[PDB]
Amino acid sequence: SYDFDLIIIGGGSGGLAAAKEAAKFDKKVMVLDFVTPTPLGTRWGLGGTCVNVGCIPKKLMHQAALLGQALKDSRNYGWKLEDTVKHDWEKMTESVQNHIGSLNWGYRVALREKKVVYENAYGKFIGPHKIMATNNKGKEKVYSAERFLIATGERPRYLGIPGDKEYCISSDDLFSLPYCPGKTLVVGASYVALECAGFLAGIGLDVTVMVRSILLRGFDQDMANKIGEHMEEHGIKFIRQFVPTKIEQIEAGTPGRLKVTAKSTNSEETIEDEFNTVLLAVGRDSCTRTIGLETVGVKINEKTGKIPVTDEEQTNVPYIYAIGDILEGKLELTPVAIQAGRLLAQRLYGGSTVKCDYDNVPTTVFTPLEYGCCGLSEEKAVEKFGEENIEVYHSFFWPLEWTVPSRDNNKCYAKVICNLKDNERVVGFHVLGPNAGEVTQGFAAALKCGLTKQQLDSTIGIHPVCAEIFTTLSVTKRSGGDILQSGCXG
Amino acid sequence: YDFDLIIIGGGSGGLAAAKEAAKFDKKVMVLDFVTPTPLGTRWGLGGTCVNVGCIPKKLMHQAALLGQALKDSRNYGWKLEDTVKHDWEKMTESVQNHIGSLNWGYRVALREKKVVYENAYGKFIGPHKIMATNNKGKEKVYSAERFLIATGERPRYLGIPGDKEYCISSDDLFSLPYCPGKTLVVGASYVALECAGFLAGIGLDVTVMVRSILLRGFDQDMANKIGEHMEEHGIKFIRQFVPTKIEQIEAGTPGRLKVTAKSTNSEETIEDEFNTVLLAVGRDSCTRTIGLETVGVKINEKTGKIPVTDEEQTNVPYIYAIGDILEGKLELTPVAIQAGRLLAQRLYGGSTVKCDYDNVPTTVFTPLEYGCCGLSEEKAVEKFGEENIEVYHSFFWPLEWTVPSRDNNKCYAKVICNLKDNERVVGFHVLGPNAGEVTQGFAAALKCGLTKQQLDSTIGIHPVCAEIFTTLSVTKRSGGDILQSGCXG
Numbered sequence A: 001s002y003d004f005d006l007i008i009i010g011g012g013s014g015g016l017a018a019a020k021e022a023a024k025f026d027k028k029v030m031v032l033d034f035v036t037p038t039p040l041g042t043r044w045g046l047g048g049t050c051v052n053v054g055c056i057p058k059k060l061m062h063q064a065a066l067l068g069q070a071l072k073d074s075r076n077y078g079w080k081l082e083d084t085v086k087h088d089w090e091k092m093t094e095s096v097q098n099h100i101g102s103l104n105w106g107y108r109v110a111l112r113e114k115k116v117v118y119e120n121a122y123g124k125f126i127g128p129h130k131i132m133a134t135n136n137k138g139k140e141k142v143y144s145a146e147r148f149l150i151a152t153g154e155r156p157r158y159l160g161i162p163g164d165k166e167y168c169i170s171s172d173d174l175f176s177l178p179y180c181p182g183k184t185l186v187v188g189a190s191y192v193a194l195e196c197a198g199f200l201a202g203i204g205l206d207v208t209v210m211v212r213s214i215l216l217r218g219f220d221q222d223m224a225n226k227i228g229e230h231m232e233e234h235g236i237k238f239i240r241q242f243v244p245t246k247i248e249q250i251e252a253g254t255p256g257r258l259k260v261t262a263k264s265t266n267s268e269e270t271i272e273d274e275f276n277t278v279l280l281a282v283g284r285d286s287c288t289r290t291i292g293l294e295t296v297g298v299k300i301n302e303k304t305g306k307i308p309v310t311d312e313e314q315t316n317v318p319y320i321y322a323i324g325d326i327l328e329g330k331l332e333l334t335p336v337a338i339q340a341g342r343l344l345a346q347r348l349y350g351g352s353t354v355k356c357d358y359d360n361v362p363t364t365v366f367t368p369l370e371y372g373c374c375g376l377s378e379e380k381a382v383e384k385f386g387e388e389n390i391e392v393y394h395s396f397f398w399p400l401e402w403t404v405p406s407r408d409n410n411k412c413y414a415k416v417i418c419n420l421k422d423n424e425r426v427v428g429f430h431v432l433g434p435n436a437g438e439v440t441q442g443f444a445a446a447l448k449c450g451l452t453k454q455q456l457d458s459t460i461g462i463h464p465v466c467a468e469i470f471t472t473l474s475v476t477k478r479s480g481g482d483i484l485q486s487g488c489x490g
Numbered sequence B: 001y002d003f004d005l006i007i008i009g010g011g012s013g014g015l016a017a018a019k020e021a022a023k024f025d026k027k028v029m030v031l032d033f034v035t036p037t038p039l040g041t042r043w044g045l046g047g048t049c050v051n052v053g054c055i056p057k058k059l060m061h062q063a064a065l066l067g068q069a070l071k072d073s074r075n076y077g078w079k080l081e082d083t084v085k086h087d088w089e090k091m092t093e094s095v096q097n098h099i100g101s102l103n104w105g106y107r108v109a110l111r112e113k114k115v116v117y118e119n120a121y122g123k124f125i126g127p128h129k130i131m132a133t134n135n136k137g138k139e140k141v142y143s144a145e146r147f148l149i150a151t152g153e154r155p156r157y158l159g160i161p162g163d164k165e166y167c168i169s170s171d172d173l174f175s176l177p178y179c180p181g182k183t184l185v186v187g188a189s190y191v192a193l194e195c196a197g198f199l200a201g202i203g204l205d206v207t208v209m210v211r212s213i214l215l216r217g218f219d220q221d222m223a224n225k226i227g228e229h230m231e232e233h234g235i236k237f238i239r240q241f242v243p244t245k246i247e248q249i250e251a252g253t254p255g256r257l258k259v260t261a262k263s264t265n266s267e268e269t270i271e272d273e274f275n276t277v278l279l280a281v282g283r284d285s286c287t288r289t290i291g292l293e294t295v296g297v298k299i300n301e302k303t304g305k306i307p308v309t310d311e312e313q314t315n316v317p318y319i320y321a322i323g324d325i326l327e328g329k330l331e332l333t334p335v336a337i338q339a340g341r342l343l344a345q346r347l348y349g350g351s352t353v354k355c356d357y358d359n360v361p362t363t364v365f366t367p368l369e370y371g372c373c374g375l376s377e378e379k380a381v382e383k384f385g386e387e388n389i390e391v392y393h394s395f396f397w398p399l400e401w402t403v404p405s406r407d408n409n410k411c412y413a414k415v416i417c418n419l420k421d422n423e424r425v426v427g428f429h430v431l432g433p434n435a436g437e438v439t440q441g442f443a444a445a446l447k448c449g450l451t452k453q454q455l456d457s458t459i460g461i462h463p464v465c466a467e468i469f470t471t472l473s474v475t476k477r478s479g480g481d482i483l484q485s486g487c488x489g
Ligand SMILES: Cc1cc2nc3c(=O)[nH]c(=O)nc-3n(C[C@H](O)[C@H](O)[C@H](O)COP(=O)(O)OP(=O)(O)OC[C@H]3O[C@@H](n4cnc5c(N)ncnc54)[C@H](O)[C@@H]3O)c2cc1C
Pocket: A009, A010, A011, A012, A013, A014, A015, A032, A033, A034, A035, A036, A047, A048, A049, A050, A051, A053, A054, A055, A058, A121, A122, A123, A124, A151, A152, A153, A154, A171, A192, A287, A290, A291, A323, A324, A325, A326, A332, A333, A334, A335, A337, B461, B462, B463
């Protein structure tokens, strides 16, 4: 029998995690990674989406925006800054790439050290236990394995409209853009769309977001709106209820000049403006189509493209497994994939019975004002637990760090969502403020311990720190009490 | 009487209890008075945290950080010129401007909630009777059914000469009318290192004189790492020395002073000269001269603390004590607020809810910040028995530093687990940026008796410093390498 115990299709966050984990148990392991180029032909190394065109470059470019904010603040803390400092897109994306690059090389090294076989090729199933590896130039080799991990993730979706593929960029492209994007239209309004609009605007560019329906579908809608309001108040332009119909090159250039024409969601009306870059951040389809799943009979959701999967990450075909984003009804987040992948390797070759817990996974939208949250949204706790069974403690706050710069009072906002039928279990947690990620993490662990509101209250705050607001959340939404206004002192 | 309740001290605990008691419609009075420092410094309503503690300390910390932030911004593409300079006066001006609005916020808040504010020193004269010596000297005599002693502490000096007339405390630093210049900081707990940290961080020549160990009371390994970090980023350390005398070599703003220090064990002597000497060497409670004899409140004579029931009651049943002046408690603001707020609940609202002093999270705001909650490594060994303790720990590198390309493998996290208890995380520690924000949540997680296997089942947030705690697999006992790093493996 076979060439490897395990072949992982995809060298992503989930891929490399399972890969690197399976190696502790001394087994023949192979990773296939291959970066199918974007429309305008962009490439990148081992590491997957987070490393190359996701969290890593996105956070870094976020930080670049924050740091501009930081420079503005420094005046009032006594730093003799000259009047305005300017931003250099090239210098920035260069450092980002320099870090991405070392991550790429880090993983290629890490695989070698753990003795995993790396093959930079496209994996396509050809028959039971048999995969074809089409390498970069065209040559194919055929490999076999006892088990398989499908960990191929997704890629940005385009609109069904013309001009979009040849003239627009996706998340995949922005992060290595060889020129300042200039005036930008970002189309779509979930984490990627707003995050990107947020940092582009933050480094000084003229940015507009074109919203089809609601902001951040799926996330607590009140929080979403506050994020939107914040973004608008800090110089991001919003075009509400419009979809683009065509993108046409009015010039070539780096950046070019493009013309976007958009129809209304309900009226008949038409708008035209012209931008330097159009960012299409409008969802992502799974790479499950062209991996030759037919030839081994893995069932996939035909409509969505996701792979349904047992609570053990097993596909309908018993030797084949799926990990990460391509899974159905899961969270498409990196730490999830890593965990899932790492724990799957435990089960297979280490005899752990520990499953992957997909419940109450914390997330953070890295909008200019960051939004971190964990558990259920207000509407969903109402839906799940019955309206007047839900109690919501909430409040605004002002990071001490902003007082001296004297800006943005009463913009930061925290709330816990509590289940009255359950000892006020904090079944929902939300915070809109700086370092939202850091704040949330702890409480997510606290949620895994089934935290109750009265336990939260018995926990003493840390002062002066943003997260302490959660220790003293006394005003309920139901109670109607004023939460503004403020004061500071009372 | 005249009042249901008189709160002696308008501090964190004071104003908290005061503002809380007001909901229950009672005649309340706050006496606050700021007894001036040796060199005669004053401030408004709000207490230590507001005027000469957390508020101005964090702000000045932030100023330091922002300098770091400017340095970093170059590699993120900001066309900074080569070096930006700092202006002490412009800084301490903004800080005061904020402190000022806080003063004039609490004064309003008391008025709105209808509490009576009297800016006067409170001294007990007999049962249910207090004397209020106002600022100019006139006294009035008030009465109340109950009393809250909420007087907090003040910086202690060394028993040596020159120190009162030539040195500054925490109390003075935060309104210093001139750039402190080259500084010696004496002492090595939160105040000493925090201050040394931000002073150096805004560009000054800073030396810390350590008597024994760093941060006595806090996990000593973390303390040392804090020390190492501070030294690696340009803070000078004089280990095992106490100053014997401080003598003015000049008057000036800043002056020029000569510090002479003896060794902890050897006979040796050192001399240097600094512009400012910051004495951060403990604080004594203001329990002495509040006329406690005249109402017979027992105080620990040795320490000055007020022993108190699990309900913040002193031995005298109508008299209560809140916050820092309490014996065997934490001297932290949120604690005093909570204690005070909850005491007012019991008295006038019939809540039976006590104040939980267990596993109060704290944060040392040293340049590399240190947050922690629960037991230290030595104390969990001591309390729970050496080989019953398992420690999962690891270094990390905030993504934010990779581009500026600095300070890999400096940030460090550990949980302390009790093997006799399902690996209860009875100890939590993190050295890294935004430590405060990181810790808070986990403190709540500890109050829920978090176990290591629950921590593990919790998914991380990426890329975020705090996620390190979700994946702490290497044990200290196991001996595994935690350096080195990589990033990718
Ligand atoms: C702009 C952006 C920002 C994001 N921000 C965050 C964030 O802040 N925090 C967070 O937790 N998550 C974030 N995410 C989501 C995150 O990228 C994913 O959750 C994560 O990368 C998924 O890992 P994976 O292994 O499932 O898929 P991927 O990481 O995408 O791994 C799949 C890899 O395999 C390759 N491949 C595909 N088909 C084949 C094949 N047939 N043969 C060989 N190789 C193949 C792919 O090209 C890719 O390299 C972000 C995503 C984007 C796009």
